[PDB]
Design a protein around this ligand. Structure first.
Ligand SMILES: Cc1ncc(COP(=O)(O)O)c(C=O)c1O
Ligand SMILES: *Cc1c(COP(=O)(O)O)cnc(C)c1O
Ligand SMILES: [Ca+2]
Ligand SMILES: [Ca+2]
Ligand SMILES: [Ca+2]
Ligand SMILES: [Ca+2]
Ligand SMILES: [Ca+2]
Ligand SMILES: [Ca+2]
Ligand SMILES: [Ca+2]
Ligand SMILES: [Ca+2]
Lengths: 301, 300
């Protein structure tokens, strides 16, 4: 028994890749789409809220307000439904409409900004919304230590446990950089020789080339006007990248060949990992790819 | 939770207690079959129908799998066939959610549509033409295949018994084929002779309770193949429950708003029926289990 869907967060499965040729290394995909909110962000939504509760920052009538590209908003929405908190989300209008529909299904109010202005415009709009709220809490996933800490505490421990501490490589897409940075930090503490790589959009190559651009890999990319505080670049053994169309193609390869329905970022991160495996062919490496969300919410794209 | 493929993730779904919605002094637990990798309970029957046919020698590498479905059985089959590299063709009514078509095609399925005003019977008729064009095929036929209710008899029911430590008073389940209801109820009644088990049908297509069919919006429920499916066992039903379309939608929204449970339309219908039942039997301390057949994302 679970007492609520909150008890279903985490403990997600790790699936081996069987049909796609992985070049003499083993690739495992951690399916964060299995979380009740259908993304890894359920983990950070839960920890950011639970820690704020313990700190006395959230009353029953505190309005939670967050800027998000979607999944953190969905995770927060689901948790706020269970907890009976009021949530307002600011999101760009360029993200999948299914994100809006999911948040609204849980009772969350959505405020939209012009997506050509990036997540920075969301953060600016949130400042305006604060002026009309008597009592609020902003989780601020871009700076809140409880974003990477959630992954340090749970995501990484699950990887270590499921693979019996045999992990050579970990690869993860980045937006805030929290899932990469928190997970890689714990993995590196327990497995000093592991290699950990973040992925970013080839069309918004902030970490690899120093500039941003428009791209279609929803959830990835850094558009707040700098590198998020929760990203820890010292953990990156290299920066990997993926083109928009390659990300979409790999998403369909995964569903056609493995029955794995992941999001666009999963396609991007997996493509990067498969390229890495090919470059490192026949080494018998155990490579773990984080699939951030499931692919259901991208049928409209 | 290391898995060799998504097939290993089928089953062992969670039972969640309802805590915010008023359940009238009984405990209601929802079995969340949306947690399956294909997002419905039909993953269980897709897996058993295919695995049993493999063992029988009815599926070779070049055998085309052909099935009529309202969606979820097709999605389950598609995900399993993707892993196993079998060619799948599905016939579905054009009145079901477009997300069903997109999901099945994502897994590589060829999806053929029939006019939904004609019901599932039209899908079954269309299967005849598809059979003529294939040298090797297997039709799982969820409406007649005992491996549909047997999957639930073997796994779903045992998970319910295990998770509640054999303390279950009432089981309530929506019907389309009748397989999930009939398989699960059969096992539960073999182990718990006092348990009450109820199927739910759409109030506006009350075939079992009133002997006629009609239009409804509770996708996945209802019987439109031209009679009662062979896998439905009406001797297990302690009564026939129903739900109206509007109430099913309202309850779907109540579940997501108040419990953070995003279930399909049939989950709203089945849950509303269980709530009504619980209200009529208020304050008896009954342990009521409701099967939530699928998750709600495909209805957006
Ligand atoms: C689908 C998806 N991919 C990638 C990311 C980025 O993850 P993080 O914020 O942990 O870098 C998010 C957020 C997301 O929702
Ligand atoms: C198939 C289905 C049903 C009916 O289940 P049976 O076990 O075939 O009676 C109910 N709800 C949904 C969402 C379904 O896909
Ligand atoms: Ca150490
Ligand atoms: Ca290093
Ligand atoms: Ca390209
Ligand atoms: Ca009462
Ligand atoms: Ca035999
Ligand atoms: Ca195929
Ligand atoms: Ca195909
Ligand atoms: Ca009504």
């Amino acid at each position: 028994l679970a007492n609520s869907v909150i008890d279903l967060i985490g403990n997600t499965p790790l699936v081996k890749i069987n049909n796609i040729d992985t070049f003499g290394n083993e690739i495992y995909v951690k399916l964060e789409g299995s979380n009740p909110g259908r993304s890894t962000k359920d983990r950070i939504a839960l920890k950011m809220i639970e820690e704020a509760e313990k700190e006395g920052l959230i009353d029953k009538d505190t309005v939670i307000i967050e800027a998000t590209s979607g999944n953190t908003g969905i995770g927060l929405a689901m948790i706020c439904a269970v907890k009976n908190y009021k949530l307002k989300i600011v999101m760009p209008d360029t993200m999948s409409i299914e994100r809006i529909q999911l948040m609204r299904a849980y009772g969350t109010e959505v405020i939209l900004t012009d997506g050509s202005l990036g997540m920075k415009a969301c953060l600016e709009k949130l400042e305006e919304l604060k002026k009309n709220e008597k009592k609020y809490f902003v989780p601020n996933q871009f700076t809140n230590v409880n974003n990477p800490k959630a992954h340090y505490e749970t995501t990484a421990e699950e990887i270590l446990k499921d693979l019996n501490n045999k992990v050579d490589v970990f690869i993860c897409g980045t937006g805030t950089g929290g899932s990469f940075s928190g997970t890689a930090k714990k993995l590196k503490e327990k497995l000093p020789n592991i290699k950990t790589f973040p992925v970013e959009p080839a069309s918004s190559p902030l970490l690899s080339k120093g500039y941003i651009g428009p791209h279609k890999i929803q959830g990835m990319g850094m558009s707040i006007g700098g590198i998020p505080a929760v990203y820890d670049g010292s953990l990156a053994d290299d920066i990997l990248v993926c083109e928009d169309d390659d990300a979409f193609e790999m998403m369909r390869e995964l569903s056609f060949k493995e029955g794995i329905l992941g999001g666009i970022s999963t396609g991007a991160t997996f493509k990067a990992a498969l390229d890495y495996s090919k470059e490192n062919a026949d080494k018998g490496l155990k490579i773990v790819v984080l699939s951030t969300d499931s692919g259901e919410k991208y049928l409209s794209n």
